[PDB]
């Protein structure tokens, strides 16, 4: 089967505006370069929340004052997003792309609905 990217269906941000979720994926070959992108979908519009490239055998790292922080044990990432406000409520999609060596592969996550309230 094709690359599969899975993430929880719903996450609630803490009262401090911090939300965490795992993005885990089943990869085809041995890519040496992987792009991980977090997109927010709402209101027929999409924006990039954060993105990072990882290479070698390193942990996905977001650089530098990003609102996103990550880990990674193999082909998965625990993402943490800070500074969220009520207006940031929406669908957060993890996109994973195998970039190098070719061929390219695309993996789009099912999406995590993040709910945020202003304390």
């Amino acid at each position, epitope marked *: *089967k*094709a*690359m*599969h990217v899975a993430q929880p269906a719903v996450v609630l941000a803490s009262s401090r505006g911090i939300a965490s979720f795992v993005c885990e994926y089943a990869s*085809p070959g041995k890519a040496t370069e992987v792009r991980v992108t977090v*997109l927010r*979908q709402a209101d*027929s*519009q*999409v924006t*990039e929340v954060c993105a990072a490239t990882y290479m070698m055998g390193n942990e996905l790292t977001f650089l530098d004052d990003s609102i996103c922080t990550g880990t990674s044990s193999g082909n998965q990432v625990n993402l943490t997003i800070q500074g969220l406000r009520a207006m940031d409520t929406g669908l957060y*999609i993890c*996109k994973v792309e195998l*970039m*190098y060596p*070719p*061929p*390219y*592969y*695309l993996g*789009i996550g099912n*999406g995590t609905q993040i709910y945020v309230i202003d304390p």
Partner: antibody
Amino acid sequence: QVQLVESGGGVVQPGRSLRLSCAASGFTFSSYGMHWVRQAPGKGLEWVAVIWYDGSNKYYADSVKGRFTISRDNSKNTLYLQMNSLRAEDTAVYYCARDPRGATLYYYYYGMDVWGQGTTVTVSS
Amino acid sequence: DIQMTQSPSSLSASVGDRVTITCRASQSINSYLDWYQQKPGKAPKLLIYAASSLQSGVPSRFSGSGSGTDFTLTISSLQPEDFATYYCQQYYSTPFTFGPGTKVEIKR
């Protein structure tokens, strides 16, 4: 009034080279992935190459690997295809086309939603 | 690379007919499939993306379905402007391959 205008096509001798250009107007070119797709006379569509919005990554059909180079100059709203070592079987109409690659409207919106009119390349002596 | 196949090669239909054509990938491509229409002398036009989403401005009689290896494009009621050739294309993995196309022609 989004526009993609190809140029550079014509007759070229086998073994020789040609550069195609695709000029964009009426949209934010630097936000879109771009592809080349070709169509030989009486035949179907064949995908040739893609280049990322910022030029950071590119991929190619196996039939043109090692011979064609895709590039772009976002400061000039222009996409290029450098074609080397041309063969009779490369004879075709060459189209350029944009692709939002999930960066506008919906995160899953991938596809060539606007195409140029094509430029014809005839490889012959 | 991923081989895309399409059936039938040609089909003859009449205005008002429900028409369904199929596309198959040689390995799973999830839902990463576009459908295009092309008429002679003209550039292709995107109809369907992500296997089942309708491109803006495309009539609602067009629909698509499938995920994995087998896909369909349906026209619920064929109109005169729908006689054309239809191509599928996968964008899961490079090269982003097209199917060989299906021609929808007028029955007589």
